[PDB]
């Protein structure tokens, strides 16, 4: 993707203004990334080197998401209903 | 996305249709959601190796700014058909 869309989405999920490193922000970015890579793969389905990075992104997402579930279920539930990933 | 298009026109075209051809191709690269930062012409220069029993040919650079790639694709497509053209290369810069 690009800095443009990246900024455009982290603005609306960051808990505050200078934050750009919260789990919510990261996992939103990640969902954008994996969706992009999937739309690449539905055309170029034989790029396993790119599916690999997809899998890494998914694992990192789920790790953040388990941590947030441990920390505040309310932010967890709210984020997942805002993203539609469960 | 600033590209750079250079092609080759066979020496045995008369100057009028040569000007017309170059108007066509500049209008193609420009008239698909683009613009042309510059449209340049060197001259009937020598070739290092022969094409189709041609020995020398024209050069024409068309430095383009664009996005979405459609113009450049149609350039390649039509330059394939056009036997008035010999070479074409695009280089993103």
């Amino acid at each position: 993707i690009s800095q443009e869309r990246k900024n455009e989405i982290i603005k609306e999920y960051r808990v505050h203004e200078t934050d750009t490193g919260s789990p919510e922000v990261q996992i939103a970015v990640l969902t954008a990334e994996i969706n992009a890579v999937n739309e690449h793969l539905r055309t170029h389905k034989k790029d396993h080197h790119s599916r690999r990075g997809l899998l890494k992104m998914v694992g990192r997402r789920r790790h953040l998401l388990n941590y947030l579930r441990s920390k505040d279920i309310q932010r967890y539930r709210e984020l997942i209903k805002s993203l539609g990933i469960r | 996305r600033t590209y750079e298009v250079m092609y080759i026109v066979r020496p045995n075209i008369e100057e009028d249709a040569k000007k017309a051809l170059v108007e066509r191709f500049n209008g193609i690269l420009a008239t698909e959601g683009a613009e042309v930062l510059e449209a340049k012409d060197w001259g009937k220069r020598r070739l290092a190796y022969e094409i189709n029993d041609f020995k020398d040919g024209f050069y024409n650079i068309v430095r383009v700014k664009s996005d979405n790639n459609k113009a450049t694709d149609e350039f390649q497509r039509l330059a394939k058909i056009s036997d008035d053209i010999i070479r074409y290369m695009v280089i993103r810069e």
């Binding site: - | 080759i8 290092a48 290369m89």
Partner: protein, 63 residues
């Protein structure tokens, strides 16, 4: 010895400057090696790209 591009400050090689490239070539159109020219690897790799492009466009010979 010395690198020509580092010497001259130029940092980006163009596929059209035969009066800059033709001295990095043998008699037979062959790319010269780096121990000969004294170039860096970055600029040598640039030379490969630029030269082979110029050859495609007939600005220089394969032979």
């Amino acid at each position: 010895k010395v690198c020509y591009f580092t010497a001259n400050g130029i940092t980006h090689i163009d596929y059209k400057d035969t009066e800059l490239l033709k001295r990095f070539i043998s008699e037979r159109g062959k790319i010269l090696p780096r121990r000969v020219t004294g170039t860096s690897a970055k600029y040598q790799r640039m030379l490969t790209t630029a030269i082979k492009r110029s050859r495609h466009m007939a600005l220089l010979p394969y032979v």
